[PDB]
Structures are given as C-alpha cells and as structure tokens.
PDB file of all heavy atoms in Angstrom:
ATOM      1  N   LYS U  70      71.168   2.697   4.280  1.00  0.00           N
ATOM      2  CA  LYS U  70      70.607   3.642   3.331  1.00  0.00           C
ATOM      3  C   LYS U  70      69.446   3.004   2.586  1.00  0.00           C
ATOM      4  O   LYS U  70      69.416   1.797   2.345  1.00  0.00           O
ATOM      5  CB  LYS U  70      71.669   4.114   2.340  1.00  0.00           C
ATOM      6  CG  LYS U  70      72.744   4.987   2.946  1.00  0.00           C
ATOM      7  CD  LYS U  70      73.687   5.495   1.875  1.00  0.00           C
ATOM      8  CE  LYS U  70      73.202   6.809   1.294  1.00  0.00           C
ATOM      9  NZ  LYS U  70      74.317   7.772   1.092  1.00  0.00           N
ATOM     10  N   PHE U  71      68.460   3.822   2.253  1.00  0.00           N
ATOM     11  CA  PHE U  71      67.243   3.324   1.642  1.00  0.00           C
ATOM     12  C   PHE U  71      67.198   3.725   0.176  1.00  0.00           C
ATOM     13  O   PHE U  71      67.549   4.848  -0.197  1.00  0.00           O
ATOM     14  CB  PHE U  71      66.006   3.853   2.377  1.00  0.00           C
ATOM     15  CG  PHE U  71      65.541   2.969   3.503  1.00  0.00           C
ATOM     16  CD1 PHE U  71      66.448   2.212   4.230  1.00  0.00           C
ATOM     17  CD2 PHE U  71      64.201   2.895   3.834  1.00  0.00           C
ATOM     18  CE1 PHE U  71      66.026   1.399   5.263  1.00  0.00           C
ATOM     19  CE2 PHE U  71      63.773   2.080   4.866  1.00  0.00           C
ATOM     20  CZ  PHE U  71      64.687   1.334   5.582  1.00  0.00           C
ATOM     21  N   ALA U  72      66.773   2.786  -0.658  1.00  0.00           N
ATOM     22  CA  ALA U  72      66.546   3.055  -2.066  1.00  0.00           C
ATOM     23  C   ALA U  72      65.131   3.578  -2.244  1.00  0.00           C
ATOM     24  O   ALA U  72      64.205   3.174  -1.537  1.00  0.00           O
ATOM     25  CB  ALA U  72      66.757   1.799  -2.920  1.00  0.00           C
ATOM     26  N   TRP U  73      64.971   4.494  -3.193  1.00  0.00           N
ATOM     27  CA  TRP U  73      63.667   5.062  -3.494  1.00  0.00           C
ATOM     28  C   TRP U  73      62.812   4.015  -4.187  1.00  0.00           C
ATOM     29  O   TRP U  73      62.859   3.876  -5.412  1.00  0.00           O
ATOM     30  CB  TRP U  73      63.793   6.314  -4.358  1.00  0.00           C
ATOM     31  CG  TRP U  73      64.014   7.542  -3.556  1.00  0.00           C
ATOM     32  CD1 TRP U  73      65.170   8.248  -3.428  1.00  0.00           C
ATOM     33  CD2 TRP U  73      63.044   8.201  -2.740  1.00  0.00           C
ATOM     34  NE1 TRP U  73      64.974   9.319  -2.592  1.00  0.00           N
ATOM     35  CE2 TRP U  73      63.675   9.311  -2.156  1.00  0.00           C
ATOM     36  CE3 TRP U  73      61.698   7.962  -2.454  1.00  0.00           C
ATOM     37  CZ2 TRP U  73      63.006  10.182  -1.302  1.00  0.00           C
ATOM     38  CZ3 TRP U  73      61.039   8.824  -1.606  1.00  0.00           C
ATOM     39  CH2 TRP U  73      61.693   9.920  -1.038  1.00  0.00           C
ATOM     40  N   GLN U  74      62.027   3.290  -3.397  1.00  0.00           N
ATOM     41  CA  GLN U  74      61.197   2.197  -3.897  1.00  0.00           C
ATOM     42  C   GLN U  74      59.750   2.418  -3.422  1.00  0.00           C
ATOM     43  O   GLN U  74      59.301   1.947  -2.373  1.00  0.00           O
ATOM     44  CB  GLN U  74      61.877   0.852  -3.543  1.00  0.00           C
ATOM     45  CG  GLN U  74      61.716   0.131  -2.190  1.00  0.00           C
ATOM     46  CD  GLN U  74      62.885  -0.728  -1.812  1.00  0.00           C
ATOM     47  OE1 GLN U  74      63.875  -0.815  -2.532  1.00  0.00           O
ATOM     48  NE2 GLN U  74      62.773  -1.386  -0.670  1.00  0.00           N
ATOM     49  N   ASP U  75      59.019   3.208  -4.214  1.00  0.00           N
ATOM     50  CA  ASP U  75      57.638   3.588  -3.938  1.00  0.00           C
ATOM     51  C   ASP U  75      57.021   4.217  -5.178  1.00  0.00           C
ATOM     52  O   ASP U  75      57.678   5.008  -5.854  1.00  0.00           O
ATOM     53  CB  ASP U  75      57.541   4.577  -2.770  1.00  0.00           C
ATOM     54  CG  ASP U  75      57.045   3.927  -1.492  1.00  0.00           C
ATOM     55  OD1 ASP U  75      56.582   2.768  -1.554  1.00  0.00           O
ATOM     56  OD2 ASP U  75      57.118   4.572  -0.425  1.00  0.00           O
ATOM     57  N   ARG U  76      55.769   3.894  -5.484  1.00  0.00           N
ATOM     58  CA  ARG U  76      55.114   4.497  -6.633  1.00  0.00           C
ATOM     59  C   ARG U  76      54.748   5.949  -6.353  1.00  0.00           C
ATOM     60  O   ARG U  76      54.347   6.310  -5.242  1.00  0.00           O
ATOM     61  CB  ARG U  76      53.862   3.715  -7.019  1.00  0.00           C
ATOM     62  CG  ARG U  76      54.150   2.308  -7.481  1.00  0.00           C
ATOM     63  CD  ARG U  76      52.889   1.574  -7.875  1.00  0.00           C
ATOM     64  NE  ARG U  76      53.201   0.420  -8.709  1.00  0.00           N
ATOM     65  CZ  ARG U  76      53.201   0.436 -10.034  1.00  0.00           C
ATOM     66  NH1 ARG U  76      52.890   1.529 -10.710  1.00  0.00           N
ATOM     67  NH2 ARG U  76      53.514  -0.672 -10.697  1.00  0.00           N
ATOM     68  N   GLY U  77      54.887   6.780  -7.380  1.00  0.00           N
ATOM     69  CA  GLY U  77      54.584   8.197  -7.262  1.00  0.00           C
ATOM     70  C   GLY U  77      55.526   8.960  -6.356  1.00  0.00           C
ATOM     71  O   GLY U  77      55.107   9.909  -5.682  1.00  0.00           O
ATOM     72  N   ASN U  78      56.795   8.566  -6.325  1.00  0.00           N
ATOM     73  CA  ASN U  78      57.805   9.219  -5.503  1.00  0.00           C
ATOM     74  C   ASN U  78      58.986   9.649  -6.358  1.00  0.00           C
ATOM     75  O   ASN U  78      60.127   9.706  -5.892  1.00  0.00           O
ATOM     76  CB  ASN U  78      58.263   8.303  -4.371  1.00  0.00           C
ATOM     77  CG  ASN U  78      57.430   8.471  -3.118  1.00  0.00           C
ATOM     78  OD1 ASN U  78      56.390   9.128  -3.134  1.00  0.00           O
ATOM     79  ND2 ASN U  78      57.883   7.878  -2.021  1.00  0.00           N
ATOM     80  N   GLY U  79      58.727   9.964  -7.623  1.00  0.00           N
ATOM     81  CA  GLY U  79      59.767  10.326  -8.558  1.00  0.00           C
ATOM     82  C   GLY U  79      60.282  11.737  -8.454  1.00  0.00           C
ATOM     83  O   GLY U  79      61.419  11.997  -8.857  1.00  0.00           O
ATOM     84  N   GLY U  80      59.492  12.664  -7.923  1.00  0.00           N
ATOM     85  CA  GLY U  80      59.967  14.019  -7.742  1.00  0.00           C
ATOM     86  C   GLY U  80      60.821  14.154  -6.499  1.00  0.00           C
ATOM     87  O   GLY U  80      61.574  15.119  -6.349  1.00  0.00           O
ATOM     88  N   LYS U  81      60.708  13.178  -5.603  1.00  0.00           N
ATOM     89  CA  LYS U  81      61.475  13.168  -4.368  1.00  0.00           C
ATOM     90  C   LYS U  81      62.779  12.394  -4.483  1.00  0.00           C
ATOM     91  O   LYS U  81      63.575  12.409  -3.538  1.00  0.00           O
ATOM     92  CB  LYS U  81      60.635  12.570  -3.236  1.00  0.00           C
ATOM     93  CG  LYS U  81      59.271  13.209  -3.063  1.00  0.00           C
ATOM     94  CD  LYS U  81      58.774  13.047  -1.638  1.00  0.00           C
ATOM     95  CE  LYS U  81      57.984  11.760  -1.475  1.00  0.00           C
ATOM     96  NZ  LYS U  81      58.082  11.219  -0.091  1.00  0.00           N
ATOM     97  N   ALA U  82      63.030  11.736  -5.615  1.00  0.00           N
ATOM     98  CA  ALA U  82      64.157  10.826  -5.748  1.00  0.00           C
ATOM     99  C   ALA U  82      65.480  11.533  -6.005  1.00  0.00           C
ATOM    100  O   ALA U  82      66.527  10.874  -5.961  1.00  0.00           O
ATOM    101  CB  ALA U  82      63.883   9.813  -6.861  1.00  0.00           C
ATOM    102  N   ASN U  83      65.471  12.840  -6.274  1.00  0.00           N
ATOM    103  CA  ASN U  83      66.720  13.567  -6.473  1.00  0.00           C
ATOM    104  C   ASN U  83      67.508  13.723  -5.175  1.00  0.00           C
ATOM    105  O   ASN U  83      68.735  13.595  -5.180  1.00  0.00           O
ATOM    106  CB  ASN U  83      66.457  14.933  -7.123  1.00  0.00           C
ATOM    107  CG  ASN U  83      65.192  15.592  -6.620  1.00  0.00           C
ATOM    108  OD1 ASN U  83      64.964  15.692  -5.421  1.00  0.00           O
ATOM    109  ND2 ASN U  83      64.365  16.062  -7.545  1.00  0.00           N
ATOM    110  N   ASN U  84      66.830  13.984  -4.057  1.00  0.00           N
ATOM    111  CA  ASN U  84      67.533  14.021  -2.783  1.00  0.00           C
ATOM    112  C   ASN U  84      67.718  12.606  -2.241  1.00  0.00           C
ATOM    113  O   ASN U  84      67.482  11.606  -2.922  1.00  0.00           O
ATOM    114  CB  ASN U  84      66.786  14.860  -1.747  1.00  0.00           C
ATOM    115  CG  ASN U  84      65.290  14.613  -1.761  1.00  0.00           C
ATOM    116  OD1 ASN U  84      64.576  15.080  -2.645  1.00  0.00           O
ATOM    117  ND2 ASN U  84      64.809  13.866  -0.776  1.00  0.00           N
ATOM    118  N   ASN U  85      68.115  12.530  -0.973  1.00  0.00           N
ATOM    119  CA  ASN U  85      68.225  11.247  -0.293  1.00  0.00           C
ATOM    120  C   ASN U  85      66.848  10.689   0.040  1.00  0.00           C
ATOM    121  O   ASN U  85      65.827  11.343  -0.193  1.00  0.00           O
ATOM    122  CB  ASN U  85      69.058  11.380   0.983  1.00  0.00           C
ATOM    123  CG  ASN U  85      70.535  11.170   0.741  1.00  0.00           C
ATOM    124  OD1 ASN U  85      71.100  10.151   1.133  1.00  0.00           O
ATOM    125  ND2 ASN U  85      71.173  12.136   0.088  1.00  0.00           N
ATOM    126  N   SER U  86      66.807   9.490   0.592  1.00  0.00           N
ATOM    127  CA  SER U  86      65.529   8.882   0.926  1.00  0.00           C
ATOM    128  C   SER U  86      65.362   8.847   2.437  1.00  0.00           C
ATOM    129  O   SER U  86      66.355   8.694   3.160  1.00  0.00           O
ATOM    130  CB  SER U  86      65.433   7.475   0.350  1.00  0.00           C
ATOM    131  OG  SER U  86      66.560   6.715   0.736  1.00  0.00           O
ATOM    132  N   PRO U  87      64.148   9.049   2.944  1.00  0.00           N
ATOM    133  CA  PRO U  87      63.893   8.818   4.371  1.00  0.00           C
ATOM    134  C   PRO U  87      64.156   7.369   4.744  1.00  0.00           C
ATOM    135  O   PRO U  87      63.796   6.446   4.012  1.00  0.00           O
ATOM    136  CB  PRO U  87      62.415   9.179   4.538  1.00  0.00           C
ATOM    137  CG  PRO U  87      62.020   9.924   3.330  1.00  0.00           C
ATOM    138  CD  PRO U  87      63.090   9.843   2.299  1.00  0.00           C
ATOM    139  N   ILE U  88      64.792   7.175   5.889  1.00  0.00           N
ATOM    140  CA  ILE U  88      65.215   5.852   6.316  1.00  0.00           C
ATOM    141  C   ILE U  88      64.414   5.433   7.537  1.00  0.00           C
ATOM    142  O   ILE U  88      64.397   6.136   8.553  1.00  0.00           O
ATOM    143  CB  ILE U  88      66.720   5.828   6.616  1.00  0.00           C
ATOM    144  CG1 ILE U  88      67.517   6.069   5.337  1.00  0.00           C
ATOM    145  CG2 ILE U  88      67.097   4.505   7.219  1.00  0.00           C
ATOM    146  CD1 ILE U  88      68.747   6.906   5.539  1.00  0.00           C
ATOM    147  N   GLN U  89      63.751   4.284   7.437  1.00  0.00           N
ATOM    148  CA  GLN U  89      63.064   3.686   8.563  1.00  0.00           C
ATOM    149  C   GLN U  89      64.054   2.830   9.331  1.00  0.00           C
ATOM    150  O   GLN U  89      65.044   2.384   8.735  1.00  0.00           O
ATOM    151  CB  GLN U  89      61.880   2.853   8.078  1.00  0.00           C
ATOM    152  CG  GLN U  89      61.153   3.453   6.870  1.00  0.00           C
ATOM    153  CD  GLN U  89      60.430   4.767   7.139  1.00  0.00           C
ATOM    154  OE1 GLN U  89      60.276   5.200   8.279  1.00  0.00           O
ATOM    155  NE2 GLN U  89      59.992   5.414   6.068  1.00  0.00           N
ATOM    156  N   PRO U  90      63.868   2.620  10.647  1.00  0.00           N
ATOM    157  CA  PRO U  90      64.831   1.817  11.416  1.00  0.00           C
ATOM    158  C   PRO U  90      64.956   0.376  10.948  1.00  0.00           C
ATOM    159  O   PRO U  90      64.025  -0.423  11.084  1.00  0.00           O
ATOM    160  CB  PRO U  90      64.270   1.863  12.842  1.00  0.00           C
ATOM    161  CG  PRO U  90      63.384   3.040  12.894  1.00  0.00           C
ATOM    162  CD  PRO U  90      63.056   3.493  11.510  1.00  0.00           C
ATOM    163  N   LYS U  91      66.114   0.044  10.392  1.00  0.00           N
ATOM    164  CA  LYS U  91      66.441  -1.337  10.076  1.00  0.00           C
ATOM    165  C   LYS U  91      67.928  -1.522  10.353  1.00  0.00           C
ATOM    166  O   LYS U  91      68.774  -1.174   9.518  1.00  0.00           O
ATOM    167  CB  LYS U  91      66.079  -1.688   8.628  1.00  0.00           C
ATOM    168  CG  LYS U  91      66.578  -3.058   8.161  1.00  0.00           C
ATOM    169  CD  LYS U  91      66.431  -3.238   6.665  1.00  0.00           C
ATOM    170  CE  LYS U  91      65.044  -3.739   6.326  1.00  0.00           C
ATOM    171  NZ  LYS U  91      64.632  -4.861   7.212  1.00  0.00           N
ATOM    172  N   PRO U  92      68.286  -1.985  11.542  1.00  0.00           N
ATOM    173  CA  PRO U  92      69.667  -2.377  11.809  1.00  0.00           C
ATOM    174  C   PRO U  92      69.997  -3.670  11.077  1.00  0.00           C
ATOM    175  O   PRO U  92      69.145  -4.529  10.863  1.00  0.00           O
ATOM    176  CB  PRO U  92      69.686  -2.593  13.327  1.00  0.00           C
ATOM    177  CG  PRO U  92      68.277  -2.834  13.693  1.00  0.00           C
ATOM    178  CD  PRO U  92      67.446  -2.050  12.748  1.00  0.00           C
ATOM    179  N   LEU U  93      71.266  -3.790  10.697  1.00  0.00           N
ATOM    180  CA  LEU U  93      71.762  -5.020  10.107  1.00  0.00           C
ATOM    181  C   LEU U  93      72.845  -5.598  11.001  1.00  0.00           C
ATOM    182  O   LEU U  93      73.457  -4.893  11.807  1.00  0.00           O
ATOM    183  CB  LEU U  93      72.289  -4.807   8.682  1.00  0.00           C
ATOM    184  CG  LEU U  93      71.371  -5.234   7.530  1.00  0.00           C
ATOM    185  CD1 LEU U  93      69.978  -4.648   7.636  1.00  0.00           C
ATOM    186  CD2 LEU U  93      71.999  -4.861   6.200  1.00  0.00           C
ATOM    187  N   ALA U  94      73.060  -6.900  10.856  1.00  0.00           N
ATOM    188  CA  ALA U  94      74.016  -7.619  11.680  1.00  0.00           C
ATOM    189  C   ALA U  94      74.606  -8.747  10.855  1.00  0.00           C
ATOM    190  O   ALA U  94      73.934  -9.313   9.995  1.00  0.00           O
ATOM    191  CB  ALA U  94      73.358  -8.172  12.944  1.00  0.00           C
ATOM    192  N   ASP U  95      75.864  -9.066  11.129  1.00  0.00           N
ATOM    193  CA  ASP U  95      76.604 -10.059  10.359  1.00  0.00           C
ATOM    194  C   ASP U  95      77.239 -11.042  11.327  1.00  0.00           C
ATOM    195  O   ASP U  95      78.098 -10.661  12.128  1.00  0.00           O
ATOM    196  CB  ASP U  95      77.645  -9.377   9.480  1.00  0.00           C
ATOM    197  CG  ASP U  95      77.030  -8.741   8.256  1.00  0.00           C
ATOM    198  OD1 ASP U  95      75.867  -9.051   7.948  1.00  0.00           O
ATOM    199  OD2 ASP U  95      77.664  -7.876   7.633  1.00  0.00           O
ATOM    200  N   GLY U  96      76.825 -12.302  11.252  1.00  0.00           N
ATOM    201  CA  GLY U  96      77.270 -13.264  12.236  1.00  0.00           C
ATOM    202  C   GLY U  96      77.378 -14.661  11.666  1.00  0.00           C
ATOM    203  O   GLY U  96      76.949 -14.941  10.545  1.00  0.00           O
ATOM    204  N   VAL U  97      77.966 -15.542  12.471  1.00  0.00           N
ATOM    205  CA  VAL U  97      78.197 -16.935  12.110  1.00  0.00           C
ATOM    206  C   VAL U  97      77.367 -17.810  13.037  1.00  0.00           C
ATOM    207  O   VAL U  97      77.406 -17.636  14.263  1.00  0.00           O
ATOM    208  CB  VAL U  97      79.691 -17.289  12.208  1.00  0.00           C
ATOM    209  CG1 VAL U  97      79.947 -18.651  11.627  1.00  0.00           C
ATOM    210  CG2 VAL U  97      80.540 -16.243  11.504  1.00  0.00           C
ATOM    211  N   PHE U  98      76.617 -18.751  12.465  1.00  0.00           N
ATOM    212  CA  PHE U  98      75.658 -19.554  13.219  1.00  0.00           C
ATOM    213  C   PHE U  98      76.013 -21.031  13.127  1.00  0.00           C
ATOM    214  O   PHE U  98      76.468 -21.503  12.080  1.00  0.00           O
ATOM    215  CB  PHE U  98      74.233 -19.341  12.708  1.00  0.00           C
ATOM    216  CG  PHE U  98      73.666 -17.988  13.002  1.00  0.00           C
ATOM    217  CD1 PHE U  98      72.632 -17.485  12.228  1.00  0.00           C
ATOM    218  CD2 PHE U  98      74.125 -17.237  14.066  1.00  0.00           C
ATOM    219  CE1 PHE U  98      72.089 -16.246  12.494  1.00  0.00           C
ATOM    220  CE2 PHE U  98      73.586 -16.000  14.337  1.00  0.00           C
ATOM    221  CZ  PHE U  98      72.566 -15.505  13.550  1.00  0.00           C
ATOM    222  N   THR U  99      75.814 -21.752  14.225  1.00  0.00           N
ATOM    223  CA  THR U  99      75.608 -23.193  14.160  1.00  0.00           C
ATOM    224  C   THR U  99      74.121 -23.476  14.305  1.00  0.00           C
ATOM    225  O   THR U  99      73.386 -22.687  14.900  1.00  0.00           O
ATOM    226  CB  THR U  99      76.376 -23.909  15.265  1.00  0.00           C
ATOM    227  OG1 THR U  99      76.235 -23.176  16.485  1.00  0.00           O
ATOM    228  CG2 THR U  99      77.843 -24.037  14.910  1.00  0.00           C
ATOM    229  N   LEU U 100      73.665 -24.594  13.749  1.00  0.00           N
ATOM    230  CA  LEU U 100      72.251 -24.936  13.826  1.00  0.00           C
ATOM    231  C   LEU U 100      72.084 -26.432  14.024  1.00  0.00           C
ATOM    232  O   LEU U 100      72.882 -27.225  13.521  1.00  0.00           O
ATOM    233  CB  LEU U 100      71.493 -24.504  12.567  1.00  0.00           C
ATOM    234  CG  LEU U 100      70.979 -23.069  12.480  1.00  0.00           C
ATOM    235  CD1 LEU U 100      71.997 -22.174  11.810  1.00  0.00           C
ATOM    236  CD2 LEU U 100      69.677 -23.037  11.727  1.00  0.00           C
ATOM    237  N   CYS U 101      71.036 -26.808  14.753  1.00  0.00           N
ATOM    238  CA  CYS U 101      70.655 -28.203  14.938  1.00  0.00           C
ATOM    239  C   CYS U 101      69.164 -28.339  14.693  1.00  0.00           C
ATOM    240  O   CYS U 101      68.378 -27.524  15.185  1.00  0.00           O
ATOM    241  CB  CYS U 101      70.991 -28.700  16.342  1.00  0.00           C
ATOM    242  SG  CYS U 101      70.053 -30.152  16.855  1.00  0.00           S
ATOM    243  N   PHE U 102      68.778 -29.357  13.940  1.00  0.00           N
ATOM    244  CA  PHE U 102      67.382 -29.642  13.662  1.00  0.00           C
ATOM    245  C   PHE U 102      67.016 -31.007  14.239  1.00  0.00           C
ATOM    246  O   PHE U 102      67.874 -31.870  14.441  1.00  0.00           O
ATOM    247  CB  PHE U 102      67.125 -29.560  12.155  1.00  0.00           C
ATOM    248  CG  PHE U 102      67.252 -28.172  11.592  1.00  0.00           C
ATOM    249  CD1 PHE U 102      68.468 -27.704  11.120  1.00  0.00           C
ATOM    250  CD2 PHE U 102      66.147 -27.340  11.524  1.00  0.00           C
ATOM    251  CE1 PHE U 102      68.581 -26.427  10.603  1.00  0.00           C
ATOM    252  CE2 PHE U 102      66.253 -26.064  11.005  1.00  0.00           C
ATOM    253  CZ  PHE U 102      67.473 -25.606  10.552  1.00  0.00           C
ATOM    254  N   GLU U 103      65.728 -31.201  14.521  1.00  0.00           N
ATOM    255  CA  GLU U 103      65.238 -32.490  15.007  1.00  0.00           C
ATOM    256  C   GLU U 103      64.192 -32.971  14.007  1.00  0.00           C
ATOM    257  O   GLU U 103      63.053 -32.494  14.020  1.00  0.00           O
ATOM    258  CB  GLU U 103      64.665 -32.378  16.411  1.00  0.00           C
ATOM    259  CG  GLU U 103      64.212 -33.700  16.997  1.00  0.00           C
ATOM    260  CD  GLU U 103      62.720 -33.738  17.239  1.00  0.00           C
ATOM    261  OE1 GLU U 103      62.054 -32.719  16.962  1.00  0.00           O
ATOM    262  OE2 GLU U 103      62.213 -34.780  17.702  1.00  0.00           O
ATOM    263  N   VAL U 104      64.584 -33.914  13.158  1.00  0.00           N
ATOM    264  CA  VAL U 104      63.789 -34.308  12.005  1.00  0.00           C
ATOM    265  C   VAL U 104      63.504 -35.807  12.072  1.00  0.00           C
ATOM    266  O   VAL U 104      64.351 -36.617  12.463  1.00  0.00           O
ATOM    267  CB  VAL U 104      64.498 -33.900  10.686  1.00  0.00           C
ATOM    268  CG1 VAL U 104      65.899 -34.505  10.582  1.00  0.00           C
ATOM    269  CG2 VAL U 104      63.663 -34.235   9.468  1.00  0.00           C
ATOM    270  N   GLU U 105      62.262 -36.169  11.757  1.00  0.00           N
ATOM    271  CA  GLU U 105      61.871 -37.565  11.567  1.00  0.00           C
ATOM    272  C   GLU U 105      61.947 -37.854  10.072  1.00  0.00           C
ATOM    273  O   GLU U 105      61.004 -37.598   9.324  1.00  0.00           O
ATOM    274  CB  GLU U 105      60.471 -37.854  12.128  1.00  0.00           C
ATOM    275  CG  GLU U 105      60.100 -37.427  13.588  1.00  0.00           C
ATOM    276  CD  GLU U 105      61.230 -37.227  14.626  1.00  0.00           C
ATOM    277  OE1 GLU U 105      62.246 -37.961  14.665  1.00  0.00           O
ATOM    278  OE2 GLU U 105      61.091 -36.295  15.450  1.00  0.00           O
ATOM    279  N   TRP U 106      63.086 -38.392   9.642  1.00  0.00           N
ATOM    280  CA  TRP U 106      63.303 -38.683   8.232  1.00  0.00           C
ATOM    281  C   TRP U 106      63.151 -40.161   7.901  1.00  0.00           C
ATOM    282  O   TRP U 106      62.784 -40.492   6.766  1.00  0.00           O
ATOM    283  CB  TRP U 106      64.686 -38.175   7.802  1.00  0.00           C
ATOM    284  CG  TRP U 106      65.117 -38.388   6.344  1.00  0.00           C
ATOM    285  CD1 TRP U 106      66.362 -38.769   5.929  1.00  0.00           C
ATOM    286  CD2 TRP U 106      64.340 -38.201   5.137  1.00  0.00           C
ATOM    287  NE1 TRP U 106      66.410 -38.840   4.560  1.00  0.00           N
ATOM    288  CE2 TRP U 106      65.186 -38.500   4.050  1.00  0.00           C
ATOM    289  CE3 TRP U 106      63.018 -37.822   4.871  1.00  0.00           C
ATOM    290  CZ2 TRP U 106      64.753 -38.434   2.728  1.00  0.00           C
ATOM    291  CZ3 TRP U 106      62.594 -37.755   3.560  1.00  0.00           C
ATOM    292  CH2 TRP U 106      63.458 -38.059   2.504  1.00  0.00           C
TER     293      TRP U 106
END
C-alpha cells in the first residue's frame, strides 16, 4: 500500500492511493567480503 506522499495531492488523499509496482521480500542472507585491511 502506498502513502499519499506528493505535493499538491491533498484533495486526492481521502480515497486510497495509486500504487506503483513495488514487490517486497523477506529473507535471510549470508555474506562474504574481500577486504585489504
């Protein structure tokens, strides 16, 4: 769901907001770095 975050969009904020495609995902990662310390 999208929050009404735009200037001059206050008359449109009573209804819902148009939603642009943004899927979300929740996962667990391992990571490895190669650093010259």
Side-chain angles (χ1 to χ4, degrees):
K70 291 184 89 138
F71 270 31
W73 274 107
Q74 85 208 1
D75 256 349
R76 296 181 161 266
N78 270 10
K81 308 205 270 151
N83 37 50
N84 42 284
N85 271 252
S86 52
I88 294 143
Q89 323 294 349
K91 172 191 274 314
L93 258 52
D95 283 346
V97 189
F98 291 157
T99 43
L100 275 92
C101 159
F102 292 90
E103 183 244 359
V104 57
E105 309 337 323
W106 180 221

